[model samples]
Target: SKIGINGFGRIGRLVLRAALEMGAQVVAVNDPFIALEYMVYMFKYDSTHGMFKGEVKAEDGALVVDGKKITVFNEMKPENIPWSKAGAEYIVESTGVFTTIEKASAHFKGGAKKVIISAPSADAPMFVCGVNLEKYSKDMKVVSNASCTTNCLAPVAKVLHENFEIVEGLMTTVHAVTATQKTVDGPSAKDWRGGRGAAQNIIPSSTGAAKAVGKVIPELDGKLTGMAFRVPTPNVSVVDLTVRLGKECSYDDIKAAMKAASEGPLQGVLGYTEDDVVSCDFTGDNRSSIFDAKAGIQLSKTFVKVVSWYDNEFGYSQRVIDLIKHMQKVDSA
Candidate 1:
């Protein structure tokens, strides 16, 4: 069956491009405000890099990428799009609208066998690859692939928990600017106090990604917390993690743990880097997150600090692709 996309914004459009490259048919696409020209623009310039480097082209009323015909539907509302008619067994809602499970379920009731939300939603099952994907079920119709920040943080937390034992921790994501932030100075809104001049200053903002971390790692759901700092950069975000381990461990021990984690299920996604590489170095890296192995050490045999970098859009999109494949396998079973 084809995959249905509910929105064609930044994440939505990227998801479409990724799915096409992975050989999944985009049976339907919904974005009322965006026109055909904008959709064509997305096709020309994908999230990873320049114009369609893969074997893709425009066909009769569809964008053919890698021989896969992607039919874009100009539907506005979630309920209006006929998923069954389009033969889409799985639906991914990147609209960034429906945040909670109730709202997401509403979309499924409208017409979708299953739904995956791009952002963190209220009380939704957050699944992080290589952590708790085993809990996923075929009957589960609604799931939340934690945000880019959460995806980067979850693995680090998991490594800490598995190796020594994370007593408590606080993380800060120095993220790149997104479309949500204004490029120039503007009037400040209620929750957007720091977002006034995002392009000019390093704005500190509240992030639900921290709160959603627990959903993926139940052990640290309420224990581990984090915030965000929106920087001027356009892509590639860094994560600063400070942890208080339960057991006494050395810096080398922590590095070994991270190395083991990376070589395991997170083989390609969780990278361990000893070289001093800046954020720009990971601009187009395919890994979900890169572990800065030489960041910090055990302050008192119980305290540890680490820094990791990730290309928010590209990294998270890669994880989304893997999650979708898992979903397909579960559904077929």
Candidate 2:
């Protein structure tokens, strides 16, 4: 159950917080970008999630959070991290680098038993906690937890696919800006809109969330596609999904199905709300997605649209913890 985090950025820091709250042991952290003191400050006070309720301080090149001393490392390369020396068995690869299996295998060389990529991978098998976590096996050394958008889409999509059967779908996520976007106008390497000021525009962007849902539910694979609108928000996000269902259903039926899933099997992974909530309402939500029942609309007998909200950073980090715990359970069994 001992874990190590590779990047102490947004997702990485949240993973530590989630792990701490969940009672998991994070023995080590590795990141070359931030100084130890800055890391402590960043963790202690987050702009969106608020201040750390517990104690945190820097002590001799390590972080002492609520009295637990966690060793910190500044290794720039994945294979060079001292995971073994720090007694870290599980490595959470949140650096947004080393995405492919070939690149992520470096963690094993540093003595990690398993590596979980925090983002979508080029080839590693993707598993969403409530959807395909049961498929994870001991031999699969490297796996992807996919993107936050994929996590939000897959669980809700599964419910619809099971009840009414989805024929095809399109998604547009009104997503919050991340560390990837520019705070001011800058030169982008690939995406033109990515270089624009983050706080100024509702940037139209591409997303793999819809396409990535296929990895979680094989039946939905090749049936869903989508785009993104990186809005001016800082934390919470909403996915507007329109789908063609094979079976006829009313708006209430879709609502019923989603509500059932949120309150039942997908309880912790999916949530539901009847309130006229906005994006900021879900800032610290731990569920993978929260279905807005009031917003769901059945355009016709077979055409439907559903909206779901997610705290991309927090929820996805919780799922990362869930996946790690799941890995432990399956490996133990």
Candidate 3:
């Protein structure tokens, strides 16, 4: 099934790269704000991902990547775009602005057989790939790849919860500033906390990870809380979780569990790190979560702490493409 990507913003452009690399036919994109030439230039050279390896150039009417001409549309609204014209059966919506089901599903009114969202939304079934990807149903046309923090939390949390019976938990993700955050000191929306300069302050913002986790792993409802610190960094995200275990567990046990998870059920989706690598080590890494083997600790019989990191933007974008292909197969089947 061919894919049509909407919104050539941060996530959308990255998803297109992954889709092309993964051998998916991305036939078109809807981004009116940018010209095809600038899109090709920006896509070729990214501040975070460095240079794109494949060939991408702007032609007379479309952008060509790997000799494939991709039609570019100027439609801002989802309904006005005709994806089928480009032979697109699936659409990856990475705008990050349209999370509502009513707004996202408008792609269905066009030629897209299904829509895969880049962020969390109640209107669509959420899939954190390795964590709860099997939960995706062909019946559900719109799918949410969820946020980066939830993707970072799901596997490690599942490994712990299934083994130790987590009773309650608090999650804090030290995240990089997103587009919503001001570059310098500036006015934010009605929310005053995010109005200050991102580089000048460690801004505290609300996170939906706790509630999003509940959807991915349903049993965690009412038992988990989360917060965020928007640091000055560009990419990479860290999660600090303190959970109440049902019984006693040692650091060795937790280490072995994470290792086994990396080798078994959560393999490929979860990573294990212990070389004292910093956040820059994972600027382009694609795994959902990287468990810090040496950082797991048992404060008491029931209290435990675990730290992990992830490539929030690039890695998360790859997942949206994966989700698109996953549903594409189902749609074709």
Candidate 4:
């Protein structure tokens, strides 16, 4: 499947790297900022994920990653960009700025068969791969790769909901700051804490993850509450979830459910660890969710508290690309 990308930010670049690694064809890249040289440099030496092992060479004004030449476009607007002319059928909107299903469908107007959003949006059909992908159809023009936090929450909640009926839940994600966060204290348009330096503070921000999960698992709505702490850490995210179930079970039962998921439905997207693994240990992990078994799953009557880990950036990026490939598979069928 030939693809085009709109933003070359952190997630966009990661998606490009993932697409290349997975042998997907990316035909065109559109971003106003950064020239070909700077983009190549960033791709070669990322501070978080470290250097790329494969060759990143710039040749004849075109950016080449592992021998594939993907043309770079400087268009500012969605309509102005030439996606179809570049022979791109799948367009990934990782800009994370100006994307809603109504407005972003302009990509299709320019000839993209589908637009895959990197962040969760309320209007678009949000599909969490393992959770609600069966609800997706080939006719849907726009769909979201729900936020990283939602990805972490869905599988954990799903397993519990299946084994033990979830009554209600509260989720707190100790998240790493994203690109939208400010590095230095600056003026914020809305919240003052958002203006504070991301590297200098442990920022508390609102999360729609719980609501987004409800979209994947409709039963979760009006029952789940979520909040987040954006710390100075560079990568990996931890979610502390407390759910009240209808029935009480031993830790072994929860363990068995997660263990079953890792081999069955959840599999590669969700992983497990019985050993003492900290947040940083999963820095480069590509799994969507990792159950920290040693951290312990506690049960108080019908209440359960569990800790989970995820490589927010890498895992989410991989999921975004994975969805694009999935769309290709369905379109071919």
Candidate 5:
């Protein structure tokens, strides 16, 4: 299936990389910022993921990566982009802009068959790869992949909800900084901490991951609350989920279910780790979330806490590609 990337930022760039590795073709990419050469440089050299393993060069206003030519567009408007030029029927809408259904639908006007948003959206139907992708229909024109935090939260939560029933939960994500934060001290219109230097402080910002989980698993809607602690790291974040289950279970019971899910049904999407791994160890790992078995604990009968780590940028991009594959597969049938 042919794919197009609407934003050439972190997620957008990595989406292309993941698509290429996963045997998908990216025919075109669009971004109003950055030059064609700069896009090639950014794609070739990423600080957190290391250098790309393929040849990438700019040629004739397009990117030639390992002999594959992808046309590049500088259009700022989605409806104005020429997606039909490269037969880019599937568009990865990672812009962080145009997140709404109405805004993202402009891509259809440009000849896109479907649009997958990289971030959370207020109204777009959201899907997590292993959580609720089965609900996706061929006619779904716009979909949200949710956020990195939501992706890491959903799989494990789904397992817990199925075995023990997650009654209520609270999450605090030790998240890494992103492009939304200021590199140095600056003023922010929404929040004060966002104005602080990203590399220097632990900024507390709000996250919708807990609530967004409901979009994927409808049963968990409004049963969870969450916040985020944006840290100095550029990649790799962990979720600290504390929940009250409907039934009392031993810590081992929880661990057993997690291990079984990770090894069987949730393979590749949900992971189980026994080793003591820091955030950096998970860098470049492809699993949506790795359940730290050691971190799984029970305070009382039904009160439990668990931790899951994710390479926010890379893992999220991986799921984005998987969702694209799912869409293509569903439509192909």
Candidate 6:
């Protein structure tokens, strides 16, 4: 079956390329603003900070890589492109537009069996690869990958939940500048209070990811809350997690729990790091999230503080790919 992409923005383009690299065929790509020539150049040049080691070329309006051909459709509307005609079974919406179940369902009416969003949606199930993917069902035609911030936070929360029963958690994502942020200071948009100087100031912003965290882990929906501080860097983002456990545990105990969690079910997605690692250290780290093994329990037995780093774009994009694969398998069953 083929895969359909709804946007070719930062995350969308990478999702398309990752799907191709993973041996899935892309049937159609829908972006209202970008031209086919720009899409080709973007893919060929490899935007989003990381460079593709090899070149990607468009032949006959299709991408040819490793001798495998992947087609592209520059259509705009969801109902305009015929996914069924293109042999596509899944559609990933990275436009960051549609924000509710009704909007997502409109895509299914267009002919896709499943629709996944790269951003958090108000009424859709928020899925984190290693956290609560078991909640997925074939009946759930519309789903959300949450957000990059939520992806990095989910595993840390999951570890605490499984190991020590987290009573409550507060997370702060020290995130890098995204494409949405202005490169220079400008007048703020409507209702945007303090987002005036994102280039020079560390603006505190709201993230729906904190609210979506509980959706991924229903037990922790209201228990975990978070905020974001958008910094001036480009790629890597850090998550500072403060968890108050049901039981008092020492720093060593928390480290042991993290070690067990990382080595156990979430090995590939959750990694334990002992080195005194910095944000730049995670530039190309392939893991979905890196648990700073050396930075656990910054306070004492009452509070557990752990620091984790992730390449927000690459790491979360990889998780989206894994999640789609999981969704396909479950849908087939």
Among all candidates shown, the one with the greatest lDDT: 2
Taking the tens digit of each residue's C-alpha lDDT, what string does model 4 give over 1-333? 788999998888989888877778898888898788998998899998889988887788778888888888887888888888888888889888656888888787678889998998878988787888778789988989899999999999999988898999999999988767898999888878888999999998899998788888998877898899999988898999988888888887888889889999998877988997877798778789999887866757677788999999889888887888788788788
Worst 10 residues of 3 by lDDT: 323-332
Which residue runs of candidate 5 sit more than 4 Å off their true CA positions? Answer: none
Candidate 4: residue 35 Cα off by (Å): 1.4
**What lDDT is reached at residue 69 by model 5?**
96
Deviation of model 4 at 285, angstroms: 1.0
Q: Residue 307 of model 4: what lDDT?
A: 90
Backbone clash count for every predicted candidate, in the order shown: 1, 0, 0, 0, 0, 1
What is candidate 5's lDDT per residue for 121-234, written digit by digit as tens? 989899998888889999889999999899999999999999999999999999999888999999998899888999999999999999999878999998998999999998
Model 4, position 77, has a per-residue lDDT of: 84
lDDT of each: 0.79, 0.93, 0.84, 0.86, 0.92, 0.78
Off by over 4 Å in 6: 47-49, 190-194
lDDT computed for candidate 6: 0.78
**Model 3 collision count:** 0
Cα lDDT of model 6 by residue, 196-310, tens digit: 6667878887776666778888888799888888888878898888888887778787778878888988888888889988888887666778988776655766687888889
Flag regions of model 2 displaced more than 4 Å: none
